[PDB]
Design a protein around this ligand. Structure first.
Ligand SMILES: *[C@@H]1O[C@H](CO)[C@@H](O)[C@H](O)[C@H]1NC(C)=O
Ligand SMILES: *[C@@H]1O[C@H](CO)[C@@H](O)[C@H](O)[C@H]1NC(C)=O
Ligand SMILES: *[C@@H]1O[C@H](CO)[C@@H](O)[C@H](O)[C@H]1NC(C)=O
Ligand SMILES: *[C@@H]1O[C@H](CO)[C@@H](O)[C@H](O)[C@H]1NC(C)=O
Ligand SMILES: *[C@@H]1O[C@H](CO)[C@@H](O)[C@H](O)[C@H]1NC(C)=O
Ligand SMILES: *[C@@H]1O[C@H](CO)[C@@H](O)[C@H](O)[C@H]1NC(C)=O
Ligand SMILES: *[C@@H]1O[C@H](CO)[C@@H](O)[C@H](O)[C@H]1NC(C)=O
Length: 417
């Protein structure tokens, strides 16, 4: 509980890159993209997609699933021990996957479909959803989720598991999900309170309603939510689909649930007009109400009319996924690898921040580095706070594309270099 908690320069994160976990592909044309990582109770689950001359998720043919353990090697730092590594049996039909580390095994929740455009012109009854689970010894097993016996809190027509990680609470799995609904049932009191220039075309009430529409169908709305899956031994499933609170709604986007410090932290990537950090601890579960933070310093780059630090409501789409991880509940401290650029996805920086001020930061690379998304997970190691982050990098514009894993420690004292 003793580490740097003040505004300072020159932090010593003791940063180290991990290279033996992520495989190295012999083919230079293959792009390894969209990594996911969830750590819990000393075990982790790593996932990434492989495609040919394209780094798009559904534009793939392989989906890697890795299980491992956190181990002390006497190195005075945590090490990743890879135990099992498998490819998803339905990879060529995977639309999205979310990892969950429960107890001492890996769990992968994937959405499989024949139609890459299923979210724009189809419904969830036309698709299938599976749980693939394994550990260091057991062979991987894939079970189909019975969405037929599912109960929903609203008239949803489609959904996909979308996010950087899930959570295990007792016998229930809670996975972040993005839902689709074809009628405007939503309110926007928070956005309507903004004091911005009125666009000559539409009103502020119209801007915020329409900003929840899909940019590829416009008759559909993308609303974030969670799915609660309880089971005994992959038997007698009870599945519930709850939407996120209508307080401070933002267009559907990949989220995250993480167990940290006795609370449950929810993160939602800001892919619409509110370019500041959407995150918060869970107050109620039905409806899924995270106590949204009022962060005024953490944002993300994007092209178009909503770049970094953009505040005003606007029909915008785009952004980057950047997980956060809490360090101290009383001091309201979090850590995150964010992108230090207004419009381009580049220059990742490890950032320890308040809701109101940035405490300290450090660039990951001295050279300019392209990075499309980051995820961060922190844990106690040797009675000290350590974190592991994965960055979706493209440093070799001439060699193959591959994500990178970094491990670092929160500085014990401020300003040591
Ligand atoms: C794709 O179509 C085939 C034939 O209709 C079907 O067997 C399969 O289950 C479909 N896949 C999904 C995810 O629905
Ligand atoms: C757009 O969504 C509506 C609502 O279900 C659907 O009927 C229509 O086919 C979709 N159009 C496209 C091009 O996906
Ligand atoms: C994980 O272990 C706990 C016991 O501490 C148990 O209650 C829970 O059902 C287990 N979860 C799974 C998915 O096996
Ligand atoms: C806009 O101004 C009003 C006061 O007229 C204020 O109450 C409100 O909080 C402001 N909007 C935002 C988003 O802060
Ligand atoms: C759970 O089911 C599997 C079969 O899929 C079986 O091998 C295993 O022993 C079962 N575990 C328990 C605790 O019943
Ligand atoms: C953010 O501000 C709102 C309005 O004052 C408040 O209700 C909410 O609790 C604040 N967030 C946190 C994390 O306290
Ligand atoms: C960070 O926020 C806390 C309130 O949670 C405040 O007391 C503190 O002054 C802030 N940090 C700095 C450097 O001012």
């Amino acid at each position: 509980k003793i580490f740097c908690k003040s505004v300072s320069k020159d932090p010593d994160f003791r940063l180290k890159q991990i290279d033996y976990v992520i495989p190295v592909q012999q083919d230079r044309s293959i792009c390894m993209n969209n990594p996911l990582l969830d750590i819990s109770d000393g075990f982790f689950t790593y996932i990434h997609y492989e495609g040919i001359n394209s780094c798009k998720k559904s534009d793939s043919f392989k989906v890697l699933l890795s299980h491992g353990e956190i181990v002390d090697r006497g190195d005075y730092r945590p090490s990743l021990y890879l135990l099992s590594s498998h490819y998803h049996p339905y990879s060529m039909q995977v639309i999205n996957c979310v990892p969950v580390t429960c107890n001492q095994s890996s769990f992968v929740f994937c959405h499989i479909s024949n139609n890459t455009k299923t979210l724009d012109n189809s419904d969830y009854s036309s698709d299938e959803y599976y749980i693939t689970y394994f550990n260091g010894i057991d062979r991987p097993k894939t079970k189909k989720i019975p969405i037929n016996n599912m109960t929903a809190d609203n008239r949803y027509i489609h959904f996909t598991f979308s996010g950087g990680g899930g959570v295990c609470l007792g016998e229930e799995f809670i996975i972040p999900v993005t839902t689709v609904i074809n009628t405007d049932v939503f309110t926007h009191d928070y956005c309507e309170s903004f004091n911005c220039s009125v666009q000559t075309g539409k009103s502020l009430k119209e801007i915020c309603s329409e900003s929840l529409r899909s940019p590829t169908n416009s008759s559909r709305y993308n609303l974030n939510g969670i799915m609660i899956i309880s089971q005994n031994n992959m038997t007698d499933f009870k599945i519930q689909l709850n939407g996120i609170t209508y307080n401070k709604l933002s267009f559907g986007s990949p989220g995250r649930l993480s167990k940290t410090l006795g609370q449950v932290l929810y993160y939602q990537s800001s892919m619409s007009w509110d370019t500041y950090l959407k995150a918060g601890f869970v107050e109620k579960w039905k409806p899924f109400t995270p106590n949204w933070m009022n962060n005024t310093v953490i944002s993300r780059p994007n092209q178009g009319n909503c770049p970094r630090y953009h505040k005003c409501p606007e029909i915008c789409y785009g952004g980057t996924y950047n997980d956060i991880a809490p360090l101290d509940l009383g001091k309201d401290m979090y850590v995150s690898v964010i992108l230090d650029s207004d419009q381009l996805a580049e220059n990742p920086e490890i950032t320890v921040f308040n809701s109101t001020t940035i405490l300290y930061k450090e660039r990951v690379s001295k050279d300019e580095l392209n990075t499309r998304s980051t995820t961060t997970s922190c844990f106690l190691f040797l009675d000290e706070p350590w974190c592991i982050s994965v960055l979706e990098t493209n440093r070799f514009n001439g060699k193959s594309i591959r994500p990178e894993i970094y491990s670092y420690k929160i500085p014990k004292y401020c300003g040591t270099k």
